[PDB]
Design a protein around this nucleic acid. Structure first.
Lengths: 171, 171
DNA sequence: ATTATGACAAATGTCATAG
DNA sequence: TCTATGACATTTGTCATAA
């Protein structure tokens, strides 16, 4: 899926036969890809999904994300920590508060991801104004936010914190 | 290319031809995928990436910035609009003029990006005392100002407009 | 426990055309 | 506009070789 993560697998010194048995993709494909005989883009979704998921599980333990945010005053700095983007968001909201980020940013991200018209919910600086419509959406079957969406919540928000830097450490 | 995200594009009510035009995937492939004659798993990463990027763009959250500024007296009012801080600044200069904002604030921000000492740079309210240093800066591209620098330009200014306020809506 | 190369049936992407 | 169906050169996935 993420061509970056599968590219990091080719960068890895793990054996092509080890990759072949761990993911299920043949050693032939892995050897030809690293050699340059094959291109990752030309590969199928199923095999690429296998390679990406395996590396993602491997990186799950040695991954730490430190968020940095700067307000207008030099003194105010917002920093959060976690191994997952969602963890960083929860650490931030308990550490600092929901009102630091843009009003109702989580709900707005969820609505747009699910294909809902923002106009119906009366979006404004004051947040979601049509609370009753949001309540109808909460009961309705929806698609829960993925980790990447949580990073977007910080970058999208500029009302209080307009500078966003994330540190990703792979060991 | 998350298969769930691509499926939400194929399960939308959007035309297979329109999806084909915006993404670049052939209408043939998109239609066969929707029919069931082809499978997403068998598709190449490049095309699946194209589909993924368009659905990601559709689900992306929009940002609109309304800037409000006032003089110390509060008799004089200034208002600007843009989806980026750079767009807000460009609108402000087009509507009001470069002189109203702090003199050579754009250059001050550039020097701050370089890290060159402001005191050594002959900093003054009048503007750039040292023309020589300007050509020195012209020699190096250095770092072109990022969007956040444009908000900082407004907040740094004290002369003329002294009250700076940014409101963000994600409609 | 490794690493390159096939062969082969089956798909793909890029173009069309037809309705 | 839009859908469906295909042509063609070409890369795939699987399953092997050989070293």
């Amino acid at each position: 899926s993420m061509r970056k993560t599968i590219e990091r697998l080719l960068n890895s010194e793990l054996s092509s036969n080890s990759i072949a048995v761990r993911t299920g993709v043949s050693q032939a494909v892995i050897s030809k890809l690293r050699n340059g005989k094959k291109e990752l883009g030309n590969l199928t979704l199923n095999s690429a999904e296998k390679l990406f998921e395996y590396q993602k599980e491997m990186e799950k333990v040695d991954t730490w994300i430190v968020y940095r945010g700067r307000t207008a005053d030099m003194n105010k700095s917002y920093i959060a920590e976690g191994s997952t983007y969602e963890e960083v968001y929860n650490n931030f909201v308990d550490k600092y508060g929901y009102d630091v980020l843009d009003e109702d940013i989580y709900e707005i991200q969820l609505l747009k991801k699910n294909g809902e018209n923002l106009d119906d919910y009366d979006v404004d600086s004051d947040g979601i104004n049509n609370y009753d419509k949001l309540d109808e959406f909460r009961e309705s079957d929806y698609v829960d936010l993925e980790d990447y969406d949580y990073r977007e919540l910080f970058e999208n928000s500029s009302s209080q914190v307009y500078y966003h830097e994330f540190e990703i450490t792979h060991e």
